Amino acid sequence: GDTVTVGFHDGPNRHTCTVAHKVEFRPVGREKYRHPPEHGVELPCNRYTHKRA
Amino acid sequence: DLDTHFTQYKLARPYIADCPNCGHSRCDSPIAIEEVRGDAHAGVIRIQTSAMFGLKTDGVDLAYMSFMNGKTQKSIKIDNLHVRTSAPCSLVSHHGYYILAQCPPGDTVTVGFHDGPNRHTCTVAHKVEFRPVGREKYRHPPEHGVELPCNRYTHKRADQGHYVEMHQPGLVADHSLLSIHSAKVKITVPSGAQVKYYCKCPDVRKGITSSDHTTTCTDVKQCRAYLIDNKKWVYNSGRLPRGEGDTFKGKLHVPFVPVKAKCIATLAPEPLVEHKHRTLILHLHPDHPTLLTTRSLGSDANPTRQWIERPTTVN
Amino acid sequence: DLDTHFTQYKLARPYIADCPNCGHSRCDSPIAIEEVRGDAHAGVIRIQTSAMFGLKTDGVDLAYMSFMNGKTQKSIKIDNLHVRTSAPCSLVSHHGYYILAQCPP
Amino acid sequence: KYKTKVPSPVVKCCGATQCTSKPHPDYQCQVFSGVYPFMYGGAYCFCDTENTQMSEAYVERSEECSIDHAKAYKVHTGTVQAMVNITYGSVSWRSADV
Amino acid sequence: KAGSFGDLQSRTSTSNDLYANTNLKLQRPQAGIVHTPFTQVPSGFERWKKDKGAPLNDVAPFGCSIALEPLRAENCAVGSIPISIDIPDAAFTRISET
Amino acid sequence: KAGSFGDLQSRTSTSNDLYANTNLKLQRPQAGIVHTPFTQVPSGFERWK
């Protein structure tokens, strides 16, 4: 996409903010994607972990 | 009709399998997507999910939906149900294992429905295309224009031009029913199932209808259970394990079928002609990439064709 | 102002016509779209629909919407209302027959 | 346009089997080793090295093949015929083919 | 041709033999999840659908269209025709009456 | 010029005459639904812009 937005409700407000900022989907290996499929070859990638601390 | 819906519901039942909804990292859902189909020129698509739609357990009220909760059946009123490609779509019809809907172009097909604690969403990365009929590209067919013969999936509840096999379900693994008895494992029966249990020693690996236990090990962790049920039937799929079930090649008519029909096409804006003598001059003002073809009538053809995108002049 | 809203509501009323919402194959709705307009550099657009917005039957509470139900009038509180191009937009203002909103391409 | 279908594969909690070739258009079958599979809340159908997998594949015509389908032909000279509108003397327009 | 123009060639409309290949290949499932991965060439029929050349009805010389059902090639104007017609003798009249 | 640079030429800022064409054309409505289809060349002023 092109613009990142975030919003959360409290009941009177939608509390949304927006930043125009480029976002990209970088494919690993040699074949472009739209999203990685269910099956195929494995490759070493890098990404943000999901641990609390 | 209702009879065809009965033949659909006579022995079929929902089932649970895995979907790679990466919002939750390879979740196993009752709504398992299998082989979405889209080849219609109008941009419609039908999807063959893993849950029974339409009739309730009784076999009426086609506004109901039945799925598999845990290890049991469960029907509920369709509360909130949506199909999303890149923008929210609009669904047309649904029957049993199938849903026919209308979506705009996109890249990943997702489907979700609420029960109140869950959103029950699954996603498949799969190309989807909007194919224009005739010669003028679209974003969506307009209100007025020329008619052309197209092909698309009908929207009738029942038909017989195709059908798929319904097959005997295989065994289902479990461990929850494997409790501790008082100092060893314990097997309970769901009152009509063959609880195929096996542990460090050769147990009854075919399943008994009577609650029992074995003392080859005390911990449940050494023994496995495999419920066996044969009251309903399911559509065999590569995403579902198959037991020794090799029987009952039953038939289930497809709900929707591609048929020929008529669609509405766009008429390009008029050209501006110029009969300048000994030759011909044309001014073109298109609004979408629009074809153009010319040919002589003499001995030779000298064909000429190319698309037009910007307002231009030709000789 | 309120007087101008009255002159808008003095004799106007909603009406029903057809729209080609192909999710339901040429449906006739009170919300009939007519001649959407967009030429502003900032990307805003205003749309001229077929239903009266703003004031109720009395002529106040610009948070109300009046449309044609069957063959009669009917006003109701604006509960859920959205304008969508390819992603959900954000509407700015609305008055009677018109709505001004902000949409992406 | 074609379409590939796959019957439900078969696995075993222990031991192994072998797959056989059947007379089908572009039939396929193969076996794999060390599965240790998984199921919903299940015992996952394993206690040891599994080495059981069928994964057969199957090809046949599509359901929409009935409508759109190219056809090939061989061509030879064949016949010729037309139609003519006629008028002579005082008789009016008369038409027939030949 | 592994999906160029012939990859599913039914000898008839409802035959039971499809003497063509699709280069189907299987794959080994991973992570102990019951599924049957595979891979194959995309259908060549689609490719030929996308890259059809000039249809004949826009290249035929002498300016003649093409109907479908009998493969009529109508109006293709060329050459001459030897004609021979006979009229009844009841449509003549004596030369002294004109 | 049917929408090249002059298709709406008001002699003044608030004149009441527009001595230019837009090649407007009408169409026959279909399916018995009350609407007025038509077609015309896109504005040439945009193209020059």
Residue B311 contacts residue B295 (beta carbons within 8 Å)? no
CA distance B275 to chain D (A): 35
Number of folded domains that form chain B: 3
CA dist E37 and D9 (Å) reads: 11
Strands (E), chain C: 17-19, 27-29, 34-37, 44-54, 64-69, 72-77, 90-102
Contacts of B143 in chain C (CB under 8 A): 20
CA dist F26 and F36 (Å) reads: 8
| DSSP notation for F1-49 | --SSS-SS-BSSTT-S-B------EE----TT-----EE-PPPHHHHH-
CA distance A12 to chain B (A): 23
For E41, the closest chain D residue by CA position comes to D2
H/E run at residue B127: strand B121-128
Q: Is residue B99 domain-resident?
A: yes
CA dist B46 and B49 (Å) reads: 10
C-beta atoms surrounding F5 within 10 Å: 11
CA dist B137 and B259 (Å) reads: 23
For E46, the closest chain B residue by CA position comes to B39
Contacts of D85 in chain E (CB under 8 A): none
Smallest Cβ distance to B144: which of F37, F42, F47?
F37
Report how many Cβ contacts below 8 Å link chain C to chain F.
6
* Interacting residues of C94 by C-beta distance below 8 A, sequence separation 6+: C53, C54, C100
Q: Is residue B228 domain-resident?
A: yes
Contact (CB<8Å) E59/B301? yes
Contact (CB<8Å) D1/E32? no
Q: Is residue B242 domain-resident?
A: no
Same domain, B55 and B188: no
How many helices (H) and strands (E) are present in chain C, helices listed first? 1, 7
Residue D67 contacts residue B151 (beta carbons within 8 Å)? yes
Same domain, B19 and B154: yes
Same domain, B41 and B90: yes
For B312, the closest chain F residue by CA position comes to F4
For E76, the closest chain B residue by CA position comes to B297
B6 phi, psi to nearest 5 deg: -65, -50
Q: Is residue B244 domain-resident?
A: no
Same domain, B106 and B207: no
| DSSP notation for chain A | --EEEEE---SS---EEEEE-----PPPTTS--SS--SSS-------------
Residue E33 contacts residue D38 (beta carbons within 8 Å)? yes
Q: Which chains touch B (3 or more CB pairs under 8 A)?
A: A, C, D, E, F
CA dist E18 and B2 (Å) reads: 38
**Which 3 state secondary structure label does DSSP give E89?**
helix
Contacts of D55 in chain B (CB under 8 A): 238
What range does the domain containing B292 cover? 265-315
Same domain, B77 and B157: yes
Here the contacts of B274-281 (C-beta below 8 Å, separation 24 or greater) are: B279/B315, B280/B315, B281/B313, B281/B314, B281/B315
Same domain, B141 and B176: no
CA dist B243 and B170 (Å) reads: 4
* Interacting residues of D42 by C-beta distance below 8 A, sequence separation 6+: B172, B173, B174, B175, B226
Q: Is residue B243 domain-resident?
A: no
Report how many Cβ contacts below 8 Å link chain B to chain D.
69
Alpha-carbon separation of residue B120 from B24, B54, B57, B87, E2 (angstroms): 11, 18, 21, 18, 40
CA dist D78 and D9 (Å) reads: 54
Contact (CB<8Å) E59/B239? no
Same domain, B230 and B292: no
Same domain, B156 and B180: no
Q: Does D93 touch chain E (CB under 8 A)?
A: no
What b/e sequence results for D30-41 when a residue is b if at least 16 CB atoms lie within 10 Å of its CB, and e otherwise?
eebeebebbbbe
Contact (CB<8Å) B269/F27? no
Smallest Cβ distance to B305: which of E54, E61, E63?
E54
Contact (CB<8Å) E63/B297? yes
CA dist B34 and B109 (Å) reads: 11
Contact (CB<8Å) F39/B311? no
Q: Does B246 touch chain A (CB under 8 A)?
A: no
Q: Is residue B42 domain-resident?
A: yes
For chain B, positions 88-107, list CB contacts with chain F under 8 A.
Answer: none
Which of C76, C36, C28, C82 is closest to C52 using CA atoms? C76
Contact (CB<8Å) D28/E29? no
Same domain, B56 and B157: yes
Contact (CB<8Å) E58/B297? no
Q: Does F43 touch chain B (CB under 8 A)?
A: no
* Interacting residues of E64 by C-beta distance below 8 A, sequence separation 6+: E73, E74, E75, E76, E77
Instruction: Return the CATH number at B207.
Output: 2.60.40.4310
For A37, the closest chain E residue by CA position comes to E37
How many helices (H) and strands (E) are present in chain E, helices listed first? 1, 2
B62 phi, psi to nearest 5 deg: -65, 5
Same domain, B113 and B39: yes
**Which 3 state secondary structure label does DSSP give B220?**
helix
Q: Does B143 touch chain F (CB under 8 A)?
A: yes
First to last CA, chain B: 61
Contacts of B104 in chain C (CB under 8 A): 86
Q: Is residue B246 domain-resident?
A: no
Instruction: Return the CATH number at B78.
Output: 2.60.40.3200
Contacts of D44 in chain B (CB under 8 A): 173, 224
Q: Is residue B245 domain-resident?
A: no
Alpha-carbon separation of residue B190 from B77, B187, B209, B239, D45 (angstroms): 27, 10, 8, 25, 19
Substitution target in E26, E30, E34, E52 with the highest count of B β-carbons within 10 Å is: E34
Same domain, B55 and B184: no
For chain A, positions 25-44, list CB contacts with chain E under 8 A.
Answer: 38-39
* Interacting residues of B121 by C-beta distance below 8 A, sequence separation 6+: B21, B23, B31, B110, B111, B112
Q: Does B238 touch chain E (CB under 8 A)?
A: yes
Residue B157 contacts residue B55 (beta carbons within 8 Å)? no
- Which experimental technique did the depositors report for determining this structure? cryo-EM
Substitution target in C18, C39, C41 with the highest count of F β-carbons within 10 Å is: C18
Q: Which chains touch D (3 or more CB pairs under 8 A)?
A: B, E
Cited resolution, angstroms: 4.2
Contact (CB<8Å) D63/B225? no
Alpha-carbon separation of residue D16 from B226, D13, D39, D45, E28 (angstroms): 19, 9, 20, 14, 16
Contact (CB<8Å) B241/D37? yes
Same domain, B13 and B142: yes
Q: Does E42 touch chain A (CB under 8 A)?
A: no
What tokens appear for B39 in the block?
Answer: 């080849």
